[PDB]
Amino acid sequence: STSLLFEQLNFLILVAAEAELPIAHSTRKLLMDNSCNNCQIYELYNENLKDVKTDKDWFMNKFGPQTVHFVISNTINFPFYKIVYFDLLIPVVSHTWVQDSVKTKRHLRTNMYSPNPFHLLRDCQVYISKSSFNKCEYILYSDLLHLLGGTLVNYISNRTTHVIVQSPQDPIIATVSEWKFVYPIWILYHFKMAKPLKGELATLCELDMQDTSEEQLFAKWEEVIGDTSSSQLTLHPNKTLFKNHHFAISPDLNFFTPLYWFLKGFIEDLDGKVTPLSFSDDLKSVYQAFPDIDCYIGHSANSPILEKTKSIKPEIHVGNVSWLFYMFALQKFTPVSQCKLIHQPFHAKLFTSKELTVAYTNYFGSQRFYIQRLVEILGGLSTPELTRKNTHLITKSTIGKKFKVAKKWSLDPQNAIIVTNHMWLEQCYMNNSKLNPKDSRFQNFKLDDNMGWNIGQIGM
């Protein structure tokens, strides 16, 4: 049979061994029979990639100039995986994604089909209760969830598998009462140990109404993630990532104290050093007493602590916690200016929910995580469904009913929902300015013709 399901999409199949040619041919045929724009094949086993820098420029020149939408691979063991997956945000999906997507006649979510064996929560649809957490806690839990391949939802549904809460006192528990209520150690365990949560340990992580005292929570945390030896030791082998670096941790990161211990152990197990700053510290003397401090880690770009810090140490690296975890995924220390806009201390909110309640289409996998992060730090909301509650539709291209409906509603002078591309979101944040989404550059819905227009490149 045939269809237009994959219309205007470019694919790249990585063949890891000659025995996989029949399934490579069988997948190209499904993609062509359903009207894909282009499907390149690349044989990993038939080229020497030793001592050639398979970097971002190498990849764009070798397989562009237009975007690749999906890389099809049943392994992540190839030397441009990190460039594809963490920088360019191109999904990497198994052969089965093509089969299932054809059978269901829809572009399925990429997460369950990732072959990264670290993506231990690829199945989970996770609600994180904002009422339960500070901003900086929420951002860290989302970072690690995304790094574990899970999906973040901002609504409870039948699809939802997990609800992350801090304590029985949290108001989300009561007002609700299938899916399971757990403490954030459910996330952190998978991250630290890289194996599923199955023992009696798995029982500790579930919401327990007897835990009305702080002393009990502290005690489950020290048990579940306190004390070590982990699985899949080969997956992040650079145990000196932060050697000769020393991080000053801002007091505007008011973490649950065991959560700070986790971040300190993560840093220190990667051979870095950590000093916590407090609000009453004299900063000149802290930095003079610890002159090897070369990085500041903070939540807000407008912290007074960060202003005085820059004055004392004007060459300090200035990052956020997200920045640490991105260095973790690249497995290389990397200056903030070479990372992404989301790896800086956050700007003050630009928009309100009322100005900015956006919906989006054709963004898979990490690009999805990225629009969501961007909307958050811009001050708005994002929804999975397009309704009339929405102020904008963000789009890359012109396909999908979602675009057609929203492009129709934008012709009405009363409605006035706006259709714009993602660079409006990005340039707004970078310039810290409410730019105009009907500008020429933000009406370009042919971004796929160039890979440099991939969401997340602006600010690099």
Add this chain to the structure above:
Amino acid sequence: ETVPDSQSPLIPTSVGSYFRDD
């Protein structure tokens, strides 16, 4: 009305929208 994801919510996003340090 509602155009689905294409890749149904009961408790909406705007209800529990605040962080405990807002």
